[PDB]
Design a protein around this nucleic acid. Structure first.
Length: 82
DNA sequence: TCTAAGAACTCTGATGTCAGTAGATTACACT
């Protein structure tokens, strides 16, 4: 960090009261942020996905696919439906 | 011709004491 030591330029409140209001205002916004991000993580937990092969595009079907690109999804389904 | 008022002692039960233990309350503090 040797070039960046400007970051040690700082000053601090002396009202412990105002500083507590900063942490109360941060604390209420955090309490809402916690609830809404949990509610979003509920929605997105059910809906998250991943793709096991990469795809090309063109005027024709890209027939010359690697063995890898069939065997990876063939396992990825068998991993997942009995 | 005797029946209670006055002792006396021990014992029981509460109140306050000390030392030590540990919990919950209250301050202190985050940039």
């Amino acid at each position: 960090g040797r070039t960046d030591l400007l970051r040690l330029r700082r000053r601090f409140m002396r009202d412990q009261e105002k500083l507590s209001l900063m942490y109360a205002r941060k604390g209420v916004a955090e309490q809402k942020r916690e609830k809404e991000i949990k509610s979003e993580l509920k929605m997105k937990q059910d809906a998250q996905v991943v793709l096991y092969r990469s795809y090309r595009h063109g005027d024709l079907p890209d027939i010359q696919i690697k063995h890898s690109s069939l065997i990876t999804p063939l396992q990825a389904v068998a991993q997942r439906d009995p």
